[PDB]
């Protein structure tokens, strides 16, 4: 199963690495929820993990392993592996293993300084806060992994396109190609930041870095990167979930359209993270706020297409009136349940997001506990659930070890607990945010500073406990699936459960237009040049580098 599909192996190493990251990163979660419930569990944690020197070292670890490391590794797994099995083509395995070593070496390189308290700068690493050089080199090598991944999938696409002159790009491949193309355009920000600034800085080659350019370049990457976390989930939710649900994807071209739109509008909207910033024209902020509302469109589409598919699925399974279908879906199946719950939470989640994006409204909530509120419904829930669920079809496909009734049932617990835990925590944080509770703060070490957030603090406490269980159960579940010597090869040679796709007459012309990838890419690049071009030119004429500090 390795030697005609060694892409299976490679793929399996990316997942394991990602899920190991997630486990280590999450540990810090419950503690941080208690802290937001006004309880200080950090001596207890410090007694358990004697390297941990502060709340903020913990928070950095959390954000770096969970949000950057787990999520990229999961994307690299899904967004190479699915197009491979659909195409029935094998990725250039030389390059594949290169990208996996690059990420593992980059991860290890950067982990050392984090673990030694040399890089307590958080996953945004905003200069002048200045971490060890190995952090920036580590992170750089780790992110640059994705460039190899990009190549690999463009390769597969080119080769299929050669074997099938004339033919429209298969759907998952289409998705992965606009995905990887989008991510390339997106990553330029961070790469420029790293190459022009963070690296020379941390190597001692220069004494200062302009804070404002620093974060304007980061946010160039920093927004599309959450689409980079989302789409591998969306990939699975469009082309795999419907089949798990007992139905079909109700539209091929809506899915393409959506993914095209994200190619187009994910990058040029980063000032939405910079509304509170000096030295960026307010006009440019309005312009970026508009494009950010436009980027919300694909997920609005996605909500309909995905819900209709699930409805259809539910009707085929004998799904009664206005709500019967819901009950007729396979609530016995964690690969179905996990993403569906994800999607429910993604409703408040995106409403959160749309408020954030409306410029002046952002002054209400920016840097409050509301932001964490928002993005846990987004990545910690929808994405992470999706990843957790897919262990139930992906892992068996990769390894051949099938899933017991027991493990299926521990999964359901894990998934429901996590979901609920997250929902509770989302109320706490939003509420506390509304009460002006700042984010990124060890607030339990100042007991009397936030007396007015008495009750939502209770929720955060609750979610801390709830998600503690969820997480331990997940650790147990995961390893029990990976530490058995149950192997039936036959389902490791069974095909991915891709969905069938309802398709129509009008499709032909719409899909054709979308398949003009070279043109749409150029359009996307131009949209970046227009949106950041003018500002970047101005910043780069008036550079004011300032020296760095270490304040931990």
């Amino acid at each position: 199963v390795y030697e005609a599909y060694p892409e299976k192996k490679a793929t399996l190493y990316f997942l394991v690495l990602g899920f190991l990251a997630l486990i280590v990163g999450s540990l810090f979660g419950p503690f941080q929820a208690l802290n937001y419930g006004n309880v200080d569990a950090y001596p207890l944690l410090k007694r358990l993990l004697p390297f941990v020197q502060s709340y903020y070292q913990g928070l950095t670890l959390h954000g770096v392993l969970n949000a950057i490391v787990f999520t990229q590794l999961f994307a690299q797994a899904i967004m190479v592996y699915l197009p491979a099995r659909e195409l029935n083509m094998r990725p250039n395995m030389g390059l594949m293993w290169l990208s996996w070593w690059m990420a593992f070496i980059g991860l290890v390189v950067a982990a050392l300084p984090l673990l030694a308290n040399e890089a307590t700068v958080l996953y945004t690493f905003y200069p002048p806060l200045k971490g060890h050089w190995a952090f920036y080199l580590g992170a750089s090598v780790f992110v640059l992994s994705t460039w190899v991944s990009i190549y690999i999938v463009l390769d597969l696409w080119r080769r299929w396109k050669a074997a099938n002159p004339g033919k429209v790009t298969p759907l998952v491949t289409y998705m992965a190609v606009v995905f990887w193309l989008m991510w390339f355009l997106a990553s330029l920000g961070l790469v420029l930041e790293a190459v022009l600034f963070l690296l020379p800085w941390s190597f001692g080659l220069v004494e200062g870095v302009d804070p404002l350019v620093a974060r304007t370049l980061f946010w160039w990457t920093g927004h599309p990167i959450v689409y980079f976390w989302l789409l591998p989930a969306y990939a699975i939710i469009y082309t795999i979930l419907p089949k798990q649900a007992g139905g079909k994807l109700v539209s091929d071209p809506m899915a393409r359209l959506a993914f095209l739109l994200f190619l187009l509008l994910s990058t040029p909207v980063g000032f939405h993270h910079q509304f509170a910033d000096p030295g960026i024209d307010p006009t440019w902020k309005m312009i970026h706020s508009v494009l950010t509302l436009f980027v919300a469109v694909p997920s609005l589409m996605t909500a309909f297409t995905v819900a209709a598919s699930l409805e259809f699925a539910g009707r085929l399974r004998g799904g009664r009136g206005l709500f019967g279908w819901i009950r007729a879906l396979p609530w016995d199946n964690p690969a179905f349940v996990a993403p569906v719950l994800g999607l429910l939470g993604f409703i408040p989640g995106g409403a959160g997001g749309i408020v954030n994006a409306s410029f002046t409204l952002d002054y209400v909530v920016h840097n409050t506990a509301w932001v964490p509120g928002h993005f846990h419904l987004q990545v910690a829930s929808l994405v992470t659930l999706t990843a957790m669920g897919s262990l139930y079809w992906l892992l068996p496909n990769l390894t051949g070890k099938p899933i017991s009734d027991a493990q299926r049932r521990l999964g359901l617990a894990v998934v429901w607990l996590w979901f609920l835990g997250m929902m509770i925590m989302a109320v706490g944080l939003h509420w506390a945010g509304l009460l002006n509770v700042p984010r990124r703060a060890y607030i339990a070490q100042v007991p009397d500073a936030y007396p007015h957030a008495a009750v939502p603090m209770v929720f955060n406490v609750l979610a801390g406990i709830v998600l503690l269980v969820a997480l331990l159960l997940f650790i147990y579940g995961l390893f029990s699936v990976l530490l058995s010597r149950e192997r039936k090869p036959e389902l490791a040679e069974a095909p991915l459960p891709f969905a069938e796709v309802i398709s129509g007459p009008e499709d032909r012309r719409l899909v054709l237009a979308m398949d003009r990838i070279g043109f749409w890419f150029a359009v996307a690049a131009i949209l970046v040049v227009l949106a950041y071009g003018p500002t970047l030119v101005q910043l780069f004429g008036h550079l004011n580098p300032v020296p760095g500090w270490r304040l931990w």
């Binding site: 960026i280 002046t360 840097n367 700042p438 703060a441 607030i443």
Partner: protein, 166 residues
């Protein structure tokens, strides 16, 4: 059937789309509204104003805290604030209600938040740059300032005070 629900689903897909745009356009309008009133003062100035963070407390407007406040209109007061590793200068700030306060804020070390609890004042403070924001307190009393941008180990305790004289 099957094909029949295809047409129907694609239809209600243009409906939903067109509705979505229109509601998004309503937001755009209501936002453009807040841009046209007083409340838009909190929007940081866009024009670059460069200062040296290593000289900011020895020479110029941020050096002496006793000089912070300066009447600059018949109803306009510019307050020079400094946000630094682990508090605010001046402490408290002291300003009159019903006047337009033009905050001009910078940092001598790293990035800080400037969030005035109870208001729309919420602005990142960047070393090397001034954050200029305008506002008019209608209600007097003690407004608390919070740093909402992690600045290092004492970040959770970085607090200030505005005292708006009735």
């Amino acid at each position: 059937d099957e094909h029949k629900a295809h047409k129907a689903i694609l239809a209600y897909e243009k409906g939903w789309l067109a509705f979505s745009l229109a509601m998004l356009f309503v937001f755009i309008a209501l936002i453009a509204y807040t841009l046209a009133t007083h409340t838009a003062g909190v929007i940081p100035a866009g024009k670059l104003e460069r200062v040296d963070p290593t000289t900011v407390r020895q020479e110029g407007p941020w050096a002496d805290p006793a000089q912070a406040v300066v009447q600059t209109g018949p109803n306009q007061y510019t307050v020079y604030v400094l946000a630094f590793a682990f508090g605010y200068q001046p402490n408290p700030i002291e300003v009159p209600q019903g006047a337009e306060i033009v905050f001009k804020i910078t940092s001598p070390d790293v990035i800080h938040g400037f969030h005035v609890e109870g208001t729309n004042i919420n602005v990142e403070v960047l070393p090397g740059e001034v954050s200029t924001v305008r506002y008019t307190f209608k209600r007097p009393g003690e407004y608390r300032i919070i740093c909402n941008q992690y600045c290092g180990l004492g970040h959770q305790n970085m607090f200030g005070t505005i005292v708006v004289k009735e």
